[PDB]
């Protein structure tokens, strides 16, 4: 308790991670005010699983995790339990029994550029699907054919990551959105993250 | 089994046009987002365009917007990339892509634009 939880450091970070290299911040030993985030004018998505979003301040958890990254607007719906697609399968995966909330907002004026922003990447090729909450930052050449690649990008030898090329004149579904996933963890230890009072 | 086959590439003069096609098998094109990428030797793979039937239906890389148009013929299960006002910087192998439980990308079609 005592001090309010440092959610501002997560939501107001100037730089956000690429989804393949998604960031995680642990939140503990603090008073969490979720209602002020939910009630704000700030987000276009605030969707919860296993909890009611309007009673978040009434709840207590052992730890909270805050994962953050940038993806396309029309990819935000892959950030949910039970989804498939290149993001849910190769980049960031939620478990079926996810308890938590997914928060997103359009970041076109920060993360798109005239001429294209190439800084944000996603994984386009992978041998198998990620486990829930798994991260893969490898850049091994993906062997698509029968011939081995020996670390050289080339014919049937794919570099596994891809730049989004976010550019501001596409419709919102292809504009960048910043995403924060709050995972609510309840172990067999006392709760250290509760709402106010 | 899912397959994509790109056609239509060739050698063109700058300012000319080409119509690329992506013939899809194993899934309905209207049920999946389909994308064009391009890559020149020794250069990074570049996202070119996308088409789907929900949310924002089409999108383009900044440098091809206004010159390229992506479209879809459900009956022929094919996606097209009409490329107008071609420039030497458009020279590349062009690939069609879909995600159907996993990533699928074609063998590509070569586009060369002389100055």
């Amino acid at each position, epitope marked *: 308790i005592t001090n309010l939880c440092p959610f501002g450091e997560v939501f107001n970070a100037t730089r956000f991670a690429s989804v393949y290299a998604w960031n995680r911040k642990r939140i503990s030993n603090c008073v969490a005010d979720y209602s002020v985030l*939910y*009630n704000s*004018a700030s987000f*276009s*998505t*605030f*969707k*919860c*699983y296993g909890v*009611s*979003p*309007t009673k978040l301040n009434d709840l207590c958890f052992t730890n909270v995790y805050a994962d953050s990254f940038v993806i396309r*607007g029309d990819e*935000v*719906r892959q950030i949910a339990p039970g989804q498939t697609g290149k993001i849910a399968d190769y980049n960031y995966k939620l478990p079926d029994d996810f308890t938590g*909330c997914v928060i997103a907002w359009n970041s076109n004026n920060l993360d798109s550029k005239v001429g294209g922003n190439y800084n944000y990447l996603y994984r386009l090729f992978r041998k198998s699907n990620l486990k829930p909450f798994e991260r893969d930052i490898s850049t091994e050449i993906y062997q698509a054919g029968s011939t081995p690649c020996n670390g050289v990008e080339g014919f049937n030898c794919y570099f596994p990551l891809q730049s989004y090329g976010f550019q501001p004149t596409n419709g*919102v*579904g292809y504009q960048p959105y910043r995403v924060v996933v709050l995972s609510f963890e309840l172990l067999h230890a006392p709760a250290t993250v509760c709402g106010p009072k | 089994q899912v397959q994509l086959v790109e056609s239509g590439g060739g050698l063109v003069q700058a300012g000319g046009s080409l119509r690329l096609s992506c013939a899809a098998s194993g899934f309905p094109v209207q049920a999946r987002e389909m994308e064009w990428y391009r890559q020149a030797p020794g250069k990074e793979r570049e996202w070119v365009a996308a088409i789907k*039937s*929900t*949310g924002t239906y089409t999108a383009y890389a900044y440098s091809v917007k206004g010159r390229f148009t992506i479209s879809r013929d459900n009956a022929k299960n094919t996606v097209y990339l009409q490329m107008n006002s071609l420039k030497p910087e458009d020279t590349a192998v062009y690939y069609c892509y879909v995600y159907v439980g996993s990533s699928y990308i074609g063998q590509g079609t070569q586009v060369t634009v002389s100055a």
Partner: nanobody
Amino acid sequence: SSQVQLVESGGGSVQAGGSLRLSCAASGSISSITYLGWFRQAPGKEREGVAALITVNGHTYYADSVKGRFTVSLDNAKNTVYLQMNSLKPEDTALYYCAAAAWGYAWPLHQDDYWYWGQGTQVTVSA
């Protein structure tokens, strides 16, 4: 399911430039409703979001095509949400659905999220 029940009314036929007002009355587990959406669908086309309202604060969202013409509002006393449709045009012709959600809010609307659905009311705008 039937946890939240939505009944629409107010649709009909109008000439281009006219106005309509759709109503959607909610019953059942109404305290759980976090979000009210108006969708529309013409046959063979996408069921697309038109407008939405967040119940905790009354914040509203509108599709670009209807901004300045449509207004969504909520009467909490009657538990009824309204879509006022002004300056109608043939392009607005569709079956309009009211929908209610309890998991928070998400804009743009997507019909594959878990929604409680009204039965739909037809709007037909003639040139």
